[PDB]
Design a protein around this ligand. Structure first.
Ligand SMILES: O=C(C[C@@H](Cc1ccc2cccnc2c1)n1cc(CNC(=O)c2ccc(F)c(F)c2)nn1)NO
Ligand SMILES: O=C(C[C@@H](Cc1ccc2cccnc2c1)n1cc(CNC(=O)c2ccc(F)c(F)c2)nn1)NO
Ligand SMILES: [Zn+2]
Ligand SMILES: [Zn+2]
Lengths: 958, 956
């Protein structure tokens, strides 16, 4: 018997291919209006999510209003005909454990949210109206244009944004690739008013022309059955109208013949040295089952023995290299080889590029390698079989984007599984990588003064020249270079995926399975995810890692040099799903090893061994010290609000060496001094570790003792004493005091501010007071301070936690001066007092449930669980059951409890107000009533400030 | 003229730099008297010396004259209020003490200068009509017993008495002088002796005016002083007592050529060589014994010590004449021993007799004696002005030995060379007269004798005549040579004129990233001396126990290295001290300014280019090891104060931590350590004395330059110059930390009531309260309840915080002591409310005199300033401002402060207690009920659970 067509559904897909470890259920379908849909049923999930991706972006901006797609994307959050309250959507999510975001690329506008699983339909309904009846309210439009402006101002002095638009500006000016996608106040308000454009109409016109159901893909993830998810999506999206808009295509490359063989010289904001080599290529998107571009990126970008980078690095010319295909749009793509440049490298760019074309020539000479393709296919297959389970919010968003590019039944696999070996396509692409098609850009402060052009949106200073034909000919004549050998088989490829059975003595949280002078070992056998992976986390404590700027510098360089020398060896492991991280900390060193457990012990032993028997190469020492010197200086160019947060940490921590102190001490770091420092640092240690995943208790102990034994044999390590295991305490602010610390950001023309209302040590009581209060003001502060007052793009509120202490913080980056932002934050706090008093007991209990859902949201993947435990461990609070305990307590809080808290600790008149503010001034630097504020005490000297105040205790361990 | 004065001495010879006025006189009753007029002194003083002591104890009552000395403090026929003397002194900014030696009992006090007569009157009655109250007698016997108890396990007292016990048992020299409850009560009771009768008998028989000397210092004219001393003291009855003599020496020939092996308490290795010698006191004008001690005890090139040290056998040596009594003396050569030295005692002594033999061969050297004469002369001329209390007590002791006109000079000014006397004494220093004692734990379990009074385990044996003979045949040893002419003798005594912009207080005259230089030209004392004070701050001096050990060993090794060179300087009045601190290094050079720059450059120069001698490094490391272990044998109240300091300070390494880290100090590790330590520094200095501002900058510059040139020093960052904070105790908290002393069978306790950060008001609340409870605390906890010999109350200052503290060492449990102190605090609460307004004002005045007392010598002023500098408070005018504020305090202010900070129910009471249990450890005013104490098990946890105070703000 033939079935019964639902008329709202053009078709239902066949089985969506998924990993056999993936327990979510899936159904694809196409609505009658052409919307492509993936439904994801996951009855376990605590949060539900949905995303919609429209296949229109800023490449289809009207030529006379740069940034319109982007601006429209902001305006859709601000109210619809069915839900006309400007913040209904944001407010609804915030009160039901939810959040949302959206972004505009060249061909896509992508909207997404998550929310408590009980409130999917309510969230989805408010969401759907975005695509049916936006208000584009005239007042809202006049305000939100500032957020977009503020967003662009954030980027103006950022080198990656400048370089991104400079590339767009050096191609064909008549090509949509050359448009400026962000927009700003000039392009979205100023000029349109000069020109008599009515921007609200332009918004309605763009929404109506391009927000067509036939360019739309939606993904919905919830607890509901696939059948119920289907009815829900049909109900809500069937009415999007189908205007059968053709999908924009860009078959002509933005780089035509007069844009090839060009050389660009560019002045950075930071002191950086980069070389960017670009070739235009055809659109490879449709070859996704062979991926010729990624084959060549894998080789040209390889970092192992025989590689291009390996030789460029041996020559002292480059330290990092990125190679492979770069996205463009439907119709064109790029192929890049970007490196950073040592001082010598900047003088040998021509040779660097010759070496690139010699490596490319080696690939031509050998021809395509099925075995290489086979490794890529095998590693991808394994990565997909054992893929970590994603957070729903990011997952709906990602999948909505790629429903445009693949058949329903392959949306999950298309980007992972390779199927076809295509030596023809590999040769096709390789043939485009030739000197006659190359574009070259050099970024260096050394061009400062010698430029004669100005990119118009960012101000970038640059010069353009034709590459001399004799240079082109010398590159065309690259003969083979014996240093370049293809990679050999990857012996880090894992093969043992067995999941060890759960030991009888296994525990729901990490157990302390070893407690000695040398080492404290926390262990948990994974009992949730059952993927063949493990995480190994080691905190090494030494007093000599941070005792003085000089030692801090030496701890940094030791680990940078170590990673630098392990890099060729560890790259094979990286490719094979096994990675590691090694940083210095204010207490010693941090070492993390993650991925397939199979060959982890081999890599870990290689790392510890190399630590304990370090052999510094002087050439690397000089190069890496020079790069570190630049890195310290380049901090001057970070965002104002980043500066604000950095200064706060300095002020409120017992010991903290500043960038300038570090920088001044760096000149006295000599190779001999560093050689002496390493054994001193390794001579005494404490090791605290978390080992968590597909490993037994015996393996964990063996792993821990192997790290121990290696340090003992080669570095003669002995334990530290317990009295040496100290931690930095937080400055304890005086009741109702208010300190202000002011600095200037000499690069960005915005200001930044962080405001910290210190409350008390962490404890069940105090944590949940602060967290519940932060939940209640979260949406209001964003809606007041950004959406309505438009103080800036970056507006943030929430708990601050450090050294066992806590408080409430606001962070804002703005065009206005810090003193103004203070009064506006104080004005906002006052209003919240009445708001909480007047809140019904039902509303109060609603915010409690929001917070409870967020705090009890179980982690989806092993790494998320490890990070939770690791936080409990390095905080030395060891409170692994914290969520149940604190939520249980939260559920007993009353709004009276919260109002007492606010009036004791936060209100402007509170007896126990502890306020410190960092004001970062810009480089050049009705409404509700702001309260009157005391005269602030101005910190001129951090050392005196700390010397003059008490220091908090540390929290008691659990 | 006047019947009460037998004679008035002539001009008392003094130093031309001494502005005090002097008059001597003998009273008709035979009391020798020196009077001292100093119209500037803030405190006046008197002292009385009775030429009777322990040697004259009744043979059946050991310690009577010592016990008598205590009993004199406890009331007289004219002032029968038991604590009248102490109370009068305390309420008038005074203090007092007394000691009993073998032939002297010496009593002294000081007091506010406006109250000399009232103090002296009460004083005089000690020697007219003591009560010897029976009740008081039965209490105070415990203070004496407790005094003996603290000594029992002290190695210096055990050996002191063991020498006496190995001489002639029939000789007074063998008497047990301290006494204890057994000899002063238990045995006299079982033998039927009335101790009170015996005290009265002893006092009547020997406290005779003919044996007394009296010294009085005050602002009054010499005439008024003469009238006051006549009034109070001519009353003393003269019984014409013969001065006891001891002509026969306690060591006869059966006590010679003897060898003693002694087991110590601490881990120490010592060799004591003793010779009997005739009494040399009458030869004091030529001083043969001191001439010989100067040479035998010399530490410079060619000396006896120098060769013993380079053979790796000995580290320190002491030589010269040792007092005994009228009739007998000793000559000693004492060394400590290395592990090798312990195995070579025979040869160590041979080397001794070789050096003695060379002195015989060369014969006496007048140029040596002439050098001593001339140095002593300079030392006397520029002698620092003494504090009254110590000066009167010193003089009263020597008035018995020298004529009045020469009493100030007799101990300094040598007369003519007497080589015959030197050859006579030297003739006694022969193997056939020697006594040898070795102290080493290696004799543990190898001894067969027990000294009665202290329990010391030892063995005695005769030195074999084959060994005597080898020593008698000691050849001359080329390694021994007389000292060379002292090149450090000062010769420029010019007092530089006060620059026109000199300061009353030190001035910050240099302030760079590397140096803070505080300078003041001396404007009070005008002696040709200077004090030079340097703090070298470095984070690596104390970052961990290994680095603290290495800072210590570095400075010990450096001093060990400099010693031969610096001994000449020390002999010429030019000395230095160099010691590691928790922030870095401290260097002090003091003395005659003439040659100072030579010594200072040498020191800074050896610091920056030091080359460790491996044999020294091993020897000093082993000694440091023993030093850390030997802390176990310190006294309970010392252990108490050490634990408290550990508990209340941010960072502090314990002896076990230092001792364990020590095995990891290798010679290579130490060599790498020093350049690291020196690589970055900050120098804060006080230069104070006979120097100009330009000279000061020059000295600072030479220091900086020497470090920069040789150690490449560079400045520290301001943010690295951090100082440790004090643990901040919670309101209404009570913490207790308990430890055992494994060696002493007493217990100790420190009780700390932390109040608040230092500040004018909090400082003077605490100091006024201290001043008000000082005497009542001593009288209640010692005199009346007799909790023990050591009882102390007062302020505690550390790291800018302060509080009130009680220290007691007792036989009673630490918790019993707690309740008795708590009881005492309650009774003090009543006393303070009952106190009259005139009493309260007396206490304000007493504290004001104490605080405003001006320094008498450069070093004392220097130290006042240095305290402002290292404490980073820089409050050079503190005393005036703080006393000004003190005077406005009211009795109700102090009551409010007590009930807020100190009372058992105070809301801001902050109490921590250290309880040190004795080795074998497990009516009266009512003690309050006490909270349950929080018991500290782990200092780290304890400190990682409390806040830390701020640091105090500098003044400017
Ligand atoms: O720039 C972009 C990203 C934009 C997208 C956007 C644009 C306009 C909006 C207007 C009102 C609400 N959301 C909006 C979001 N974006 C994302 C965020 C992050 N959200 C918060 O921090 C936040 C926190 C707590 C809240 F209660 C809350 F409502 C927000 N901020 N801006 N795309 O081009
Ligand atoms: O032992 C010794 C030394 C003895 C001498 C001695 C013996 C018995 C005494 C009885 C009552 C009063 N003084 C006495 C003194 N001594 C010295 C000290 C030090 N004085 C204080 O600490 C103190 C502090 C504040 C006061 F108000 C106060 F009165 C005393 N304690 N004992 N000689 O043999
Ligand atoms: Zn945006
Ligand atoms: Zn005594």
């Amino acid at each position: 018997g033939i079935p019964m067509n639902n008329p709202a559904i053009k078709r239902i897909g066949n089985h969506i291919t998924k990993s056999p470890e993936d327990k979510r259920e899936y159904r694809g379908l196409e609505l009658a209006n052409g919307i492509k849909v993936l439904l994801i049923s996951d009855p376990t999930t605590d949060k539900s999510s949905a995303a919609l991706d429209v296949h229109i972006g800023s490449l289809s901006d009207p030529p006379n209003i740069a940034g319109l797609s982007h601006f429209l994307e902001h305006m859709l959050f601000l109210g619809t005909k069915k839900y006309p309250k400007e913040n209904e959507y944001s407010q609804f999510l915030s009160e039901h454990a939810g959040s949302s975001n959206a972004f505009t690329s060249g061909e896509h506008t992508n909207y997404y949210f998550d929310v408590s699983h009980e409130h999917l339909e309510g969230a989805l309904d408010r969401f759907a109206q975005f695509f049916l009846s936006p208000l584009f309210d005239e007042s809202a439009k006049d305000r939100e244009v500032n957020a977009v402006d503020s967003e662009h101002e954030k980027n103006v002095m950022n080198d990656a944004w400048r370089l991104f638009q400079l590339e767009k500006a050096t191609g064909n000016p008549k090509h949509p690739f050359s448009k400026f996608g962000t927009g700003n106040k000039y392009t979205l308000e100023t000029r349109p008013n000069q020109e008599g454009i009515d921007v609200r109409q332009e918004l309605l016109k763009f929404h109506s022309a391009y927000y067509s159901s036939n360019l739309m893909a939606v993904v919905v993830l919830g607890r509901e059955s696939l059948d119920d998810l289907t009815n829900l999506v049909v109900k809500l999206f069937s009415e999007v109208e189908n205007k059968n808009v053709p999908l924009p295509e860009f078959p002509e490359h933005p780089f035509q013949e007069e844009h090839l063989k060009q050389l660009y010289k560019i002045v950075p904001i930071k002191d950086i040295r980069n070389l960017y080599v670009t070739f235009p290529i055809p659109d490879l998107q449709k070859y996704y089952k062979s991926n010729p571009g990624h084959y060549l990126g894998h080789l040209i970008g390889h970092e192992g023995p025989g590689s291009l980078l390996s030789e460029l690095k041996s020559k002292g010319w480059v330290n990092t290299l990125v190679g492979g295909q770069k996205e463009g749009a439907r119709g064109f793509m790029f192929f890049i080889i970007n490196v950073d440049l040592t001082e010598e490298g900047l003088l040998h760019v021509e040779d660097i590029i010759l070496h690139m074309f010699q490596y490319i020539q080696k690939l031509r000479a050998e021809g395509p390698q099925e075995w290489v393709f086979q490794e890529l296919k095998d590693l991808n297959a394994v990565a997909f079989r054992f893929k970590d389970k994603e957070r729903p919010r990011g997952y709906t968003s990602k999948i909505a984007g790629i429903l445009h590019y693949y058949p329903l039944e392959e949306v999950l696999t298309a980007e992972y599984l390779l199927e076809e070996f295509r030596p023809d396509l590999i040769e096709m692409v390789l043939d485009k990588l030739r000197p006659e098609n190359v574009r070259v850009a050099i970024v260096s402060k050394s061009f400062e003064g010698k430029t004669d052009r100005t990119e118009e949106w960012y101000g970038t200073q640059y010069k353009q020249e034709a590459i001399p034909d004799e240079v082109i000919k010398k590159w065309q004549n690259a003969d083979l270079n014996g240093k370049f050998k293809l990679p050999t088989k990857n012996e880090f490829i894992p093969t043992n995926f067995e999941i060890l059975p759960l030991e009888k003595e296994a525990t729901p949280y990490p157990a302390l399975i070893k407690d000695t002078a040398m080492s404290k070992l926390w262990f948990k056998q994974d009992d949730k995810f059952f993927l063949p992976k493990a995480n190994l986390n080691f905190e090494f404590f030494s007093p000599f890692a941070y005792v003085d700027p000089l030692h801090s510098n030496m701890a940094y360089l030791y680990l940078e040099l170590l990673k630098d020398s392990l890099n060729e060896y560890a790259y094979a492991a990286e490719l094979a799903g096994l990675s590691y991280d090694l940083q210095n900390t204010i207490y010693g060193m941090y070492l993390s090893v993650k991925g397939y457990n199979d060959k982890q012990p081999i890599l870990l032993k290689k790392i510890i061994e190399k630590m304990a028997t370090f052999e510094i190469d002087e050439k690397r020492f000089e190069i890496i010290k020079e790069a570190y010197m630049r890195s310290l200086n380049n901090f001057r160019a970070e965002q104002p609000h980043q500066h604000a947060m950095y200064y706060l940490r300095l002020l409120m921590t017992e010991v903290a060496w500043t960038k300038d102190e570090l920088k001044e001490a760096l000149d006295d770091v000599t190779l001999p001094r560093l050689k002496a420092f390493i054994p001193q640092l390794l001579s005494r240690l404490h090791i605290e570790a978390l080992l968590h995943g597909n490993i037994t208790k015996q393996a964990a102990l063996g792993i821990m003792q192997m790290v121990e034994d290696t340090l003992i044999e080669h570095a003669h390590t002995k334990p530290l004493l317990p009295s040496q295991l100290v931690r930095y305490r937080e400055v304890q602010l005086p009741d109702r005091g208010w300190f202000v610390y002011q600095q200037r950001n000499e690069v960005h023309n915005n200001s930044g501010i962080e405001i910290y209302y210190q409350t008390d040590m962490q404890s069940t009581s105090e944590n949940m007071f602060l967290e519940l209060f932060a939940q209640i003001i979260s949406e209001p502060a964003f809606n007041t301070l950004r959406t309505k007052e438009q103080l800036g793009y970056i507006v943030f509120s929430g708990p601050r936690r450090a050294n066992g202490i806590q408080g409430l913080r606001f962070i804002i980056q703005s065009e206005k001066p810090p003193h103004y932002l203070e009064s506006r934050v104080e004005a906002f706090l006052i209003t919240m007092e009445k708001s909480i008093e007047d809140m019904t007991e039902e509303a109060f209990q609603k915010h409690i449930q929001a917070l409870a859902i967020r705090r009890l949201d179980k982690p989806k993947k092993l790494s998320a669980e490890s990070a939770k435990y690791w936080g409990e461990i390095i905080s030395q609070q060891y409170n692994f059951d914290r969520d149940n305990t604190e939520v249980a307590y939260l559920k007993t809080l009353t709004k009276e409890d919260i109002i007492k808290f606010y009036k004791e600790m936060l209100a402007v008149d509170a007896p126990r107000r502890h306020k410190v503010s960092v004001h970062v001034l810009a480089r050049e630097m009705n409404l509700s009533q702001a309260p009157a504020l005391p005269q602030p005490e101005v910190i001129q000297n951090m050392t005196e400030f700390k010397r003059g105040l008490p220091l908090f205790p540390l929290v008691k361990p659990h």
